[PDB]
């Protein structure tokens, strides 16, 4: 996102605005205002690595913008938008991740490495790799009888098409010592 | 749902894996080891794009 | 199938191991996944976009 202080009615601020957004969900619902538009209309821009060097970014669009004029004890604890040089803003951090890590629930609550595992173990599970398995003659292949999407979810899922082709089930799990097996 | 992006050679679904490397034509300076007739170095690998 | 389509290889070397590249870089932020990489062996040499 581009934040140019073009706010002749305030501070430095995001190009795209509630209108743009609603004009998108507009065409979303219709299933004209695309990604390409967000681009050409100089609202969002592709910044590579090298160029990334010479810029400043804001994580949260909001939070990291309006002025400072109580604080939730249960939530975590973030630093702040200490500056106004913000030339760009992060569409959403969650996007640093990847296909794998994207299905991991609450990855921001696991000792780091734990997530690198789920990252290659999930590549060893079962589900429904396609809907035409019935018509494919691949050497070896597995399909879980009754797949269920998951209870816990991720906004990332949605695009990875997880809920339409899950890879596991929701088990009523209990955590306790029993027979000792 | 298939997102393609792959090939179908002699039958099987083949995937060309992304290959990483150092960008060509660019200058970089590197320091040398204790035992070295040379102090520092200016490298540039030129490749007709 | 998705995660395989967005995978990258990074030629090893003689003095392999070290960590010059097997390490997770700052520059990497946003471009490559931080958590997803193979355990041991070519760890960090194969990255996922």
């Amino acid at each position: 996102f581009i934040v140019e202080d073009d706010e002749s009615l305030g501070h430095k601020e995001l190009k795209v605005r509630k209108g743009h957004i609603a004009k998108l969900m507009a065409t979303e619902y219709q299933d004209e205002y695309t990604w390409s538009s967000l681009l050409n209309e100089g609202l969002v821009e592709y910044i590579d690595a090298e160029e990334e060097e010479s810029i400043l970014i804001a994580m949260q669009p909001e939070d990291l913008e309006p002025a400072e004029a109580d604080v939730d004890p249960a939530k975590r604890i973030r630093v702040s938008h200490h500056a106004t040089t913000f030339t760009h803003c992060e569409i959403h951090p969650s996007m640093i991740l990847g296909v794998a890590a994207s299905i991991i629930p609450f990855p921001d609550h696991n000792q780091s490495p734990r997530n690198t595992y789920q990252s290659a173990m999930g590549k060893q599970a079962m589900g429904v790799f396609l809907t035409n398995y019935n018509v494919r003659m691949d050497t070896m292949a597995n399909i879980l009888y009754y797949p269920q999407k998951p209870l816990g979810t991720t906004r990332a899922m949605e695009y990875l098409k997880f809920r339409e082709l899950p890879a596991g089930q929701n088990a009523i799990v209990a955590i306790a010592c029993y027979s000792g097996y | 749902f298939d997102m393609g992006g792959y090939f179908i050679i002699n039958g099987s679904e083949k995937v060309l894996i992304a290959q990483e490397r150092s960008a060509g034509n660019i200058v970089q300076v590197f320091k040398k080891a204790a035992p070295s007739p040379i102090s520092h170095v200016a490298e540039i690998r030129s490749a007709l794009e | 199938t998705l995660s395989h389509l967005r995978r990258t290889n990074t030629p090893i070397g003689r003095d392999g191991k070290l960590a010059k590249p097997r390490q997770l870089h700052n520059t990497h932020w946003g471009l490559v996944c931080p958590a997803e990489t193979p355990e041991g062996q070519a760890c960090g040499l194969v990255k996922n976009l």
Partner: peptide
Amino acid sequence: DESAPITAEDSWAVISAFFREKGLVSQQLD
């Protein structure tokens, strides 16, 4: 106020538009 700010949840709508066009395997294709 087709020009007011933009809060959290809004981000998504954008992202949606992204993959709408681009698509998970973009790069391999292009």
